[PDB]
Structure 1
Amino acid sequence: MTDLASIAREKGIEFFLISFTDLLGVQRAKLVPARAIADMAVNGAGFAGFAAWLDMSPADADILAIPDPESLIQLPWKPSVGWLAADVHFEGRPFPKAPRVALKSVLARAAGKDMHLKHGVECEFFLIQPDGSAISDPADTQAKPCYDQDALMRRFDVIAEICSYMVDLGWGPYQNDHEDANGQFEMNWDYADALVTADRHAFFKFMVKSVAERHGLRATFMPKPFAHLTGNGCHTHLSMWTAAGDNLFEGDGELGLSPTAYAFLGGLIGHAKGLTAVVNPTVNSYKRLNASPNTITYGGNNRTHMVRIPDAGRLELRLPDGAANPYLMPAAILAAGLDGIETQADPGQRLDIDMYVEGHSVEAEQLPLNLLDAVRALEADEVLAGGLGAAAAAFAKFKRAEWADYKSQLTEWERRTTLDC
């Protein structure tokens, strides 16, 4: 197609943002003027990977980040800037420690079996005061705030703005909601090819953060930003397709699922523990797993299990929180799912229970309850560790560092509880 330089001329783009996601979900970007896009579209932009979360050294050569021209997004709030998602290349080949590179690998394995992952994201977020002390709306205070029309329309301006951008960009948004915590929201768009979805996820986090700042607010995807309120989820909708456009998950077993889906499901259940460290990747993530419901169970149309079946041909994975890496998250679910399929794994009986009331009477395999045990879990699950490749160890290394960091902090809790021993 027409080179990025040519688009830059027709559509009036003055600068490109060349962007990649590192192991921690941090967006690293670089701002290049149009007069330079041509050269980089082809050779990529040069960063020093040791400065980002990539487990590299100062002595290594600068990595090259090659833009995916198919990913261009003209910032709807600032049209002269062109945003681009990029693969980090190192010494010729794509760098297997960058998340988009790892996602694209797992996809290629699945591809060569005529299996195509498609997923949707439920990115919840709070809107907060710029200084982070409190939610953005002091009038949002009732016990059960969910779907509060009052508080919802109080933030219409910023919501509507971002939703309309999504309409224009073609993501096909269909709903905007106030969620179950004061100050918390969700905006939903259509499911798509994993890679498409992933980019959209990385960009959505940027847009909402960016737009909210322009309205003198702040967006946070943090798992548990307030001691007194529920946290941010990032539940995921999954479906496997053939190139021929057929839903491999749709079938005639129970609930409308095929045997293939139930092996995929078995894969999830099989790797739930190590999978946990990846979609609950921060010390803060583990407040949510210590409310009650930390047990490994599906499913059915029921919001009380680690997995839900909403409809024929779909699994909802109610495990990942807001801190989830947009590329590392699909990547790792895919790994565990392809295993389910390749080892014809057994999910076990369904359970139509409400686990909040009747989950104590069920004997159930339990998820890890803190980062360290979670990392330990990922480190032992070699099937998983292999599906992500060199990334897995890098991740584990960083998160073991973060653990130590958090544990070295002197809390008021320590001093209140121990000053008197």
Structure 2
Amino acid sequence: DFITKNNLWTNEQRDAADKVLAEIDSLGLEMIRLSWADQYGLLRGKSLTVASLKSAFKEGSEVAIGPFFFDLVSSMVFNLFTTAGFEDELSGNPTVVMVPDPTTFKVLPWADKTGWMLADLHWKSGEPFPLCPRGIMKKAVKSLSDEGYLFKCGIELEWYLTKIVDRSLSPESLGAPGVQPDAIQVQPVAQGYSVLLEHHLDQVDDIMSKVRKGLLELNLPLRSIEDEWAPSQMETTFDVMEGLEAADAALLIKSAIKQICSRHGYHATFMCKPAINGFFASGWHMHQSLVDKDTRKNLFIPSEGEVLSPLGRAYAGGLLANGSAASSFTTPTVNGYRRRQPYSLAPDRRAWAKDNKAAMVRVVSATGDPASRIENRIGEPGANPYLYMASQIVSGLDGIKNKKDPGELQESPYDAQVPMLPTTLAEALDALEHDSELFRSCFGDTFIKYWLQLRRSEWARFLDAEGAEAAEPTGAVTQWEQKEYFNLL
């Protein structure tokens, strides 16, 4: 019993495991997917039979770390054939153990008799695997809990709904290791640039009603479905969730949207800005408040003369001060930097403002209002949820602990004289490299080295394919971006 021997499950987790096995027998489920987010936030793993899952509830399930050493097209960035003497060399294909987390169990409503659960990656020694994004989120959550606070997050996701025309499965379109396969061919499902039009919601509801039902059956706190600005651009928002549960929920939300749509011949994409005429950039704005661990009261609520409590003001200051170093985490994709431009309802600057969607940090609050909170509009829909939320926790807590000041609330953020944000992924990586202390301390030195190496390899690929001129945010979306992100994100 690997799990008990290394005391990897709390009592809550073990009892949850008992009730999960009961639900599996009662429903007659036949498969249970055991998955974990990779560096890109994509779910990787295996589907197990009932017997194999009950065995994994004791021994775990051995898996290889290959995904971490691959980019999205399986370029070998770190050599996988040499057993290392690991955290210093980042080489080899060592085996890790998927340790199931029973509290995350779900029945997938769109699949045949299939359940679903996340796993934490552990060395066979029993120590956590240092590249696991979920582990990084757990570390951030624990540091926040050590400071006496809980992270409350409202998930607000923009994405694109399209109808599949060709799945690009012909042999000649499959690429190779390090060679992008062809993008799926699609057709928009509705005109746009008539924001929040009810008729648009009705027009697409033959499929969106299935997405809605799937989310509701997964017991996710769906809050709203909305027609976004662009043609076929949708928005789904969720009620407030807390910490690790919130990150897991975002992961499942994106997975479920994509799988339901594909099951009915649609392609949902969280690629920031697809290379399709008429498609405007999508954003992932992170609504966030801190509550007291004990009182469970929103500690961002302002007084009469304030936009935020002094605690929320310092949290905003930390968000702004670290927004450049954290850019590669909030906006991991090269195509996410298409949003780094003015007059776009997306931030190009490290500025905060009250109820102004031109700013990076938008304060939504009223005196005494427990909904008072920060909206960070820097994120992209394809961000790894664990890294996005952990970067937010780390930045805000750095602001609180070092009592950093956000400065003046900016009326007219796009004319503000504040430090500019990175305009390319390379700039974001540069910003992290030269200001790495906070994230090396909180995310881990080994992880930051691995991250820098991998993301720079991807940037070199993009630059080799398209050239430097293309990186310009206002430029047209390149085919490299489409063939890197459209299918999988």
Q: TM-score, normalised by structure 2?
A: 0.78
The range that moved more, 127-136 or 196-205, is: 127-136
Which position in structure 2 is the counterpart of 1:94?
128
Distance, in Å, in 1 between the alignment partners of 2:255 and 2:425 is 26
After superposition, residues 377-392 of structure 1 pair within 5 angstroms as 377-381=431-435, 382-389=437-444, 390-392=446-448
Does the Cα contact within 8 Å between 1:158 and 1:212 map onto a contact in 2? yes
Which position in structure 2 is the counterpart of 1:417?
none
What displacement does 1:379 show? 1.4
Q: Quick check: 1:374 aligned with 2:428?
A: yes
Which position in structure 2 is the counterpart of 1:50?
66
What displacement does 1:396 show? 1.6
- Call closer, same or farther: CA 1:178–1:30 in 2, change over 3 Å: same
SS at match of 1:129: strand
Which position in structure 2 is the counterpart of 1:279?
330
Distance, in Å, in 2 between the alignment partners of 1:26 and 1:201 is 12
Aligned pairs, number: 405
Does the Cα contact within 8 Å between 1:19 and 1:84 map onto a contact in 2? yes
Q: Quick check: 1:238 aligned with 2:271?
A: no
Distance, in Å, in 1 between the alignment partners of 2:374 and 2:304 is 14
Distance, in Å, in 1 between the alignment partners of 2:305 and 2:54 is 53
Q: Quick check: 1:169 aligned with 2:169?
A: no
Deviations 1:362-420 (A, max 9, x none): 31210011111110111122213322113222222111011010111157x99xxxxxx
After superposition, residues 6-405 of structure 1 pair within 5 angstroms as 6-53=22-69, 57-58=80-81, 59=83, 60-78=93-111, 80-90=113-123, 91-130=125-164, 131=166, 132-137=184-189, 140-142=190-192, 144-226=193-275, 228-244=278-294, 245-252=296-303, 254-290=305-341, 292=343, 293-311=347-365, 312=369, 313-353=372-412, 355=413, 359-360=414-415, 362-381=416-435, 382-389=437-444, 390-405=446-461
Distance, in Å, in 2 between the alignment partners of 1:102 and 1:254 is 37
Task: Name stretches of at least 5 consecutive residues in structure 1 with no aligned partner.
Answer: 415-421
Does the Cα contact within 8 Å between 1:49 and 1:56 map onto a contact in 2? no
Identity among equivalent pairs (%): 27
- Call closer, same or farther: CA 1:95–1:225 in 2, change over 3 Å: same
SS at match of 2:287: strand
Distance, in Å, in 2 between the alignment partners of 1:15 and 1:56 is 34
Distance, in Å, in 2 between the alignment partners of 1:304 and 1:401 is 32
Moved over 6 A (4+): none
What displacement does 1:11 show? 2.5
Does the Cα contact within 8 Å between 1:4 and 1:41 map onto a contact in 2? no
Which position in structure 2 is the counterpart of 1:407?
463
SS at match of 1:396: helix
Q: TM-score, normalised by structure 1?
A: 0.91
- Call closer, same or farther: CA 1:249–1:42 in 2, change over 3 Å: farther
Does the Cα contact within 8 Å between 1:126 and 1:135 map onto a contact in 2? no
Does the Cα contact within 8 Å between 2:153 and 2:287 map onto a contact in 1? yes
The range that moved more, 13-22 or 91-100, is: 91-100
Deviations 1:174-226 (A, max 9, x none): 21111111111011111111211111111111111111112211010001103
Deviations 1:1-29 (A, max 9, x none): 22543331113221110000011112102
Distance, in Å, in 2 between the alignment partners of 1:134 and 1:16 is 31
- Call closer, same or farther: CA 1:385–1:180 in 2, change over 3 Å: farther
Matched letter for residue 279 of structure 2: L
Distance, in Å, in 2 between the alignment partners of 1:319 and 1:135 is 28
SS at match of 1:101: helix
Matched letter for residue 132 of structure 2: A
Task: Name stretches of at least 5 consecutive residues in structure 2 with no aligned partner.
Answer: 1-14, 71-77, 84-92, 167-183, 471-489
Does the Cα contact within 8 Å between 1:71 and 1:85 map onto a contact in 2? yes
Matched letter for residue 284 of structure 2: C
Distance, in Å, in 1 between the alignment partners of 2:407 and 2:99 is 44
RMSD: 2.1
What displacement does 1:80 show? 1.5
